[PDB]
């Protein structure tokens, strides 16, 4: 047992290792979307920049959980980072819809982690999840919803003009 | 199916670039694992942790630049799973530096094979890209890791915990 | 023989004279495109500025090759600069497609020059072409591909609105 | 007919296309002369810089006529740019004498262009040629005459000392 | 075998040790030339300064090859540095002609070293020689041929006035 | 006989040429030591930096003597620079002991040169050696003795820890 470990359930330690993997997985999905928009036959530079920024933020989300595992005296066990479900993300609107679904899936995992921390009477871990993850998730999900709504109302994805102008005026 | 930009870019080179993107992401993940080993309360060498986190971010840059190259030449990125590292516990500062040295020589071997493929397919843009952005970076990385291994061994690591502590402070700090 | 000449094949010297001509030709094509977009019945000022910049860069490409010829002790022999294939470039989209074909033709010529340098064991000339020309050509072709993709997706050339907005938001 | 065209004779439009060709020809002659002086067996760097500057100014002279053609509603028709009459310009003095001759030939063309504008009652074109071209030519011809006079008095082209000192003290 | 050594042929290691000696020999030749021009019976201070600068640059060329040898895991074996072929360099023109011959001999040795790197499939060593040495050699050879041409055209070495004015106006 | 020469014995001239050689020799020993410490299997960067700075200072000692030879109207005759006695300097302590022996040998040569200047009644040369060389040698020998003492007392060369900490805290 770590000399630092106090009130830190084995189930919590294991759940943090699963969440670390899911944040790295989210980083990889965003990295894939980024370079889709960099293709010469897609060529939406601000979509590319937006998703690359998201990719770097997900890596920070993972690193902060690795720091938490060590702060609580848990042991990090990394797993393979699975490749994203798509190679071709089809359109700006479809990438934003896939990102929205990804962020709600990550949020569901964080809410299960919070329930576990509550069930094991771990108020430090509950507070860490509320403070650093749950509001960030609600803000990310609201921003992706707003982007989806605008792209739909503009006529995406059938209007290439719509995706071009969204790229310039919202993401640029 | 052929990109409007594609010129003198062999399908074998496009595939070799997808394999190299995977290996650079792999190397990033190895260095991330090493970084958080040294952050453990029972290891607690912060400058080793910082050194390997910096290496992790640089390997991510190496991957992103190859993804940019793929699209520049009109090839198509196909990502694969990023395999977890061979170890969870890296044992010591010396053992982590020896594992990083082996990793960097394995990455360099892959880059030399990619350069040979660019040469055999008469792709001088790709040959130049690999020489300019990867091959001297690898030779510099391998020489630094060799220098670090030598100093740790000469100081008495890994048995001398005093050695790794003082190396952490005076070389990596 | 020049007092500076060393390891510089006659074939290489001749191929550098043909490349000087091709860079001046490319400069002239872009000058013609530039002033097409300046016509009162075309009036896309950022297309004009974009192609005039490209024309000035091709002149620089020519001058640097003339400098190389003298550095290696070859002798510059200039040839007529042929006028471009069109007087009327039709549309923003058509000029960009014509520029993309021109840059791929210039790249083919540079790759033949690199092969000749390699075949004559001229590592100085190989390196010169790689360092100053081959990566510039890859960047130029990618940028022109991106521009063609955006114009097509926006509905060019039939949409005069598409060419107007592209002129403003991408080239402006 | 262009919606902008007013008081612009077809002959004047055709004369401006001929003058664009002649300005681009002059630019090419000066570029040739520049890289002659850069040869390892000539090696007068301030002659080289002087002539390259003159090359770049002639390109500006051509672009300004292209702008004028579009301003008046005429249509630009480019022609091949003929290579210069020499590959080897022989000496600093001979280059300066050939430049003087070239500038007097361009001046003669500009004076015929002015007579045409006067004969067609085109005072805008007459003014444009007087304002932008005729005093520049008189200044250029006077400077080239001054340079020829000094190189001759100094002992050029037989004195290699003369050309070296002129390069340093007048052109440097 | 060094723990760093990878794809580095013994022949390449030995060729690098030979090139280190040749760069140190070139440094020594230029040091000799420098102090010939500092003699009270020669007294061309800018020739002295020019050659001493060339001497310090050759020392940098040697040091960078010593670094390369250790970077690749090869072992530096230093050899005697042979004194230059002359004690008395006769004139400014003669020193410049000897320097041009020296820089072409060093270039031939670097081209041989590049061929060896190519034959041993050592692209890192090939790129190192092209990046740091081959273009520097072409620039040095072009500069020395320019200097020889000017001194000859001015009347050197028989004109002590020529060498005096070249020392002031080109090297000062 | 040089027009500047006064009270400058042939024996003094010859001794100055021998001292120039010895200073160049010392520069080469320190260069060799420098790149020994840069080897991947030695890797003491501050030892490397220390010895390279010494190498550059010995070069300055040789150049100032060449200047003196010319100031006095003597004639420089350069000799081969012999390679150092070792390729492998074994340890930081062994390198410092070898440097101490070298500096005492150079000092002995300078003391014999001073005796020559005294025996030939050359007060200018006597003062030159005292002012520029003898106090510098005393300072270099004391510094090297202090470094040898500290390395021995720390437990070098058997303690790799000693040489590491000396590199950081004394040379760094
Ligand atoms: Fe996240
Ligand atoms: Fe990498
Ligand atoms: Fe070009
Ligand atoms: Fe003009
Ligand atoms: Fe050199
Ligand atoms: Fe000394
Ligand atoms: Mg985010
Ligand atoms: Mg797996
Ligand atoms: Mg690295
Ligand atoms: Mg361009
Ligand atoms: Mg013709
Ligand atoms: Mg002018
Ligand atoms: Mg190559
Ligand atoms: Mg010293
Ligand atoms: Mg000898």
DSSP string, D84-141: PS-S---SHHHHHHHHHHHHHHHHHHHHHHHHHHHHTT-HHHHHHHIIIIIHHHHHHH
Residues 134-163 (E) with a CB less than 8 A from some CB of D: 142, 145-147, 149-150, 152-155, 159, 162
- State the Cα–Cα distance between residues C3 and E148, nearest whole angstrom: 9
Each as own residue / partner, the long-range contacts of residues E10-16 (CB below 8 Å, 24 or more positions apart, any chain) are E11/E116, E11/E120, E12/E72, E12/E74, E12/E116, E12/E117, E12/E120, E12/E122, E12/E125, E13/E69, E13/E72, E13/E74, E13/E75, E15/E112, E15/E113, E15/E116, E16/E65, E16/E68, E16/E69, E16/E72, E16/E74, E16/E113
Interface contact C153-A168, CB threshold 8 A: no
Task: Give CA A147 to chain center in angstroms.
Answer: 16
CB atoms within 10 A of CB D79: 15
Please name the residues in contact with D78: beta carbons below 8 A apart, sequence gap of 6 or more.
Answer: C28, C31, C32, C83, C84, C87, D17, D20, D21
Instruction: Tell me the angle at which helices D45-72 and C10-37 cross, rounded to the nearest 10 degrees.
Output: 30
F164 touches chain E (CB under 8 A): no
How is residue D83 annotated by DSSP?
Answer: P
Q: Which conformational region is residue D155 in: left (phi greater than 0), alpha (psi within -120 to 50 degrees), or beta?
A: left
Say whether the D–C interface has 3 or more Cβ pairs within 8 Å: yes
Output the CA torsion D25→D27→D30→D36 (10° steps): -80
C-alpha distances in Å from residue E120, one per residue of B26, C122, E8, E13, E15: 30, 17, 8, 11, 12
CB B153 within 8 A of CB B160: no
> CB B139 to CB E70 under 8 A?
no
Please indicate if the annotation marks B115 as binding a ligand.
Answer: no
Q: Where are the alpha helices (DSSP H) in chain F?
A: 10-37, 45-71, 92-119, 123-129, 135-154, 160-169
B72 touches chain C (CB under 8 A): yes
d(CA B142, CA B156): 21
From the list B143, D171, D143, the residue with the least C-alpha distance to F45 is B143
Alpha carbons within 13 A on the beta-carbon side of E55? 19
Nearest CA-CA partner of E6 in B103, B27, B51: B103
What is the C-alpha to C-alpha distance for residues D64 and D112, in angstroms, rounded to an integer?
Answer: 18
- Which of E142, E145, E155 is the closest to D160 by Cβ? E155
C-beta atoms of D40 and C2 within 8 A: yes
Contact B148, B97 (CB under 8 A): yes
Q: Which residues of D, range 33-62, sit inside 8 Å of C by Cβ?
A: 35, 38-41, 52, 59
Binding-site residue positions of A for Fe cation: 23, 58, 61, 103, 137
* Contact (CB, 8 A) for A12 and A117: yes
Nearest to D60 by CA among D94, D30, D100, D102: D30
Residues F52 and E83: beta-carbon distance below 8 Å: no
Contact state of E3 with B101 under an 8 Å Cβ cutoff: yes
Nearest-angstrom CA–CA distance, E169 and E157: 16
CB atoms within 10 A of CB E119: 11
Structure token pair of residue A48: 């590319």
Nearest-Cα distance to chain B for A70, in Å, is 5
- Residues bordering ligand 3, an ion, CB closer than 5 Å: C 23, 58, 61
Method used to determine the 3D structure: X-ray
Q: Mapping DSSP to helix (H, G, I), strand (E, B) and coil, where does residue A93 land?
A: helix
Count CB-CB contacts under 10 A for residue B81.
Answer: 14
Evaluate whether D26 touches D61 at the Cβ level (below 8 Å).
yes
Cα gap E95→D61, rounded to integer Å? 46
E58 marked ligand binding residue: yes
Distance from the CA of E117 to the center of ligand 13, in angstroms?
Answer: 10
Question: Whose CA is closest to C95, among C81, C109, C84?
Answer: C84
Residue A81 DSSP SS3: strand
Q: What gap in Å lies between CA D81 and CA D76, rounded to an integer?
A: 15
Specify the DSSP class assigned to residue C91: S
Residues in CB range of F115: below 8 A, 6 or more apart: none
Count of CB atoms situated within 10 Å of the CB of F167: 23
Q: Give the count of beta carbons closer than 10 Å to the beta carbon of residue B128.
A: 24
Q: How far is CA B150 from CA B94, B109, B143, C24, C84, in A?
A: 9, 22, 11, 56, 64
Q: Is B29 on the interface with A (CB under 8 A)?
A: yes
Determine how many CB atoms are found less than 10 A away from the CB of residue A135. Answer: 10
CA distances from D49 to C32, D31, D55, E84 (A): 27, 10, 10, 38
The span from the CA of D163 to the CA of D155, in Å, is 8
CB E114 within 8 A of CB E134: yes
Resolution of the model in angstroms: 2.0
Do residues C140 and B130 make contact, with C-beta atoms less than 8 angstroms apart? no
Q: How much of chain D is helix, strand and coil, in % rounded to 5?
A: 75, 0, 25
**Angle value at C-alpha C133, between C129 and C135, nearest 5 degrees:** 110
> Does residue E157 have a cis peptide bond before it, meaning omega lies within 30 degrees of 0?
yes
Between the CA of B101 and the centroid of ligand 2 the distance, in Å, is 12
Nearest to F109 by CA among F139, F129, F84: F129
Inter-chain CB proximity B154 and F165 less than 8 Å? no
Alpha-carbon distance of A31 to A38, in angstroms, equals 11
In angstroms, the CA D102 to CA D151 distance is 18
Alpha-carbon dihedral sign for residues F39, F43, F47, F53: positive
Binding site listing of A: 23, 58, 61, 103, 137
Contact E28, F81 (CB under 8 A): yes
Helix (H), strand (E), coil (C) string for chain E: CCCCCCCCCHHHHHHHHHHHHHHHHHHHHHHHHHHHHCCCCCCCHHHHHHHHHHHHHHHHHHHHHHHHHHHCCCCCCCCCECCCCCCCCCCHHHHHHHHHHHHHHHHHHHHHHHHHHHHCCCHHHHHHHHHHHHHHHHHHHHHHHHHHHHHHHHCCCCCHHHHHHHHHHCCC
Half-sphere exposure of E120 (CA within 13 A, CB side): 19
Query: What H or E segment, with its residue span, contains residue A161?
Result: helix A160-169
Q: Tell me which residue of C126, F63, B94 sits closest to E59, measured CA to CA.
A: F63
Of E100, E134, E145, the CB nearest to C123: E134
User: Which of F32, F41, F78 shows the shortest C-beta gap to E32?
Assistant: F78
Q: CA A142, A146, A151 angle in degrees (round to 5)?
A: 150
DSSP C7: S
> Residue F87 to residues B151, E77, F83: CA-CA distances in angstroms?
21, 6, 9
Do the beta carbons of residue B43 and residue B37 sit within 8 Å?
yes
Length of chain D, please? 172
Partner-chain contact C78 D67, CB within 8 Å: no
Of B131, B140, B146, the CB nearest to E123: B131
Interface probe with F: pick from B140, B150, B169, most Cβ of F within 10 Å: B150
The residue of chain D nearest to residue C64, with distances taken between CA atoms, is: D35
Task: Give just the sign of the alpha carbon dihedral E81, E85, E90, E96.
Answer: negative
The count of other CB atoms within 10 Å of the CB of residue D161 is: 18
Pick from F41, F42, F161: CB nearest B155: F161
| 3-state SS assignment for residue D81 | strand
The Cα A113–Cα A111 span in angstroms is 5
Name the residue facing B125 among C115, C138, C149 (closest C-beta).
C138
| Gap between the Cα atoms of D51 and B18, Å rounded | 50
- Using the beta-carbon criterion (under 8 Å), do C76 and D40 form an inter-chain contact? no
Nearest to A77 by CA among A137, A26, A18: A18
Residues 6+ positions from A149 with CB-CB distance below 8 Å: none
Residue F126 token pair: 């006597």
Instruction: Give alpha helix (H) positions in chain C.
Output: 10-37, 45-72, 92-119, 123-129, 135-154, 160-169
In this structure, the number of other CB atoms found within 10 A of the CB of residue E33 comes to 26
Question: How many residues does this entry show for chain E?
Answer: 172
Q: Does C70 reach chain E within 8 Å, measured CB to CB? A: yes
User: Is residue F157 reached through a cis peptide bond, with omega within 30 degrees of 0 on the bond before it?
Assistant: yes
Q: Is E137 annotated as a binding residue?
A: yes
Neighbours of A96 (CB within 10 A): 27
Closest listed residue to residue A92, CA positions, set A142, A49, A136, A58: A49
- Name the token pair of D136: 């520049």
């Amino acid at each position: 047992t770590s000399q630092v470990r106090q009130n830190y359930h084995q189930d919590s330690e294991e759940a943090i290792n699963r969440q670390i993997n899911l944040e790295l997985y989210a980083s990889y999905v965003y990295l894939s979307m980024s370079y889709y928009f960099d293709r010469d036959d897609v060529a939406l530079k601000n979509f590319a920049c937006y998703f690359l920024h998201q990719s770097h933020e997900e890596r920070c989300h993972a690193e902060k959980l690795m720091k938490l595992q060590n702060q609580r005296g848990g042991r990090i066990f990394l797993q393979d980072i699975q490749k994203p479900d798509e190679d071709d993300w089809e359109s700006g609107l479809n990438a934003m819809e896939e990102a929205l679904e990804l962020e709600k899936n990550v949020n569901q995992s964080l809410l299960e982690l919070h329930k576990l921390a509550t069930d094991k009477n771990d108020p430090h871990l509950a507070d860490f999840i509320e403070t650093h993850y749950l509001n960030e998730q609600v803000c990310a999900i609201k921003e992706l919803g707003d982007h989806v709504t605008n792209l739909r109302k503009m006529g995406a994805p059938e209007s290439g003009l719509a995706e071009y102008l969204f790229d310039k005026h919202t993401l640029g």
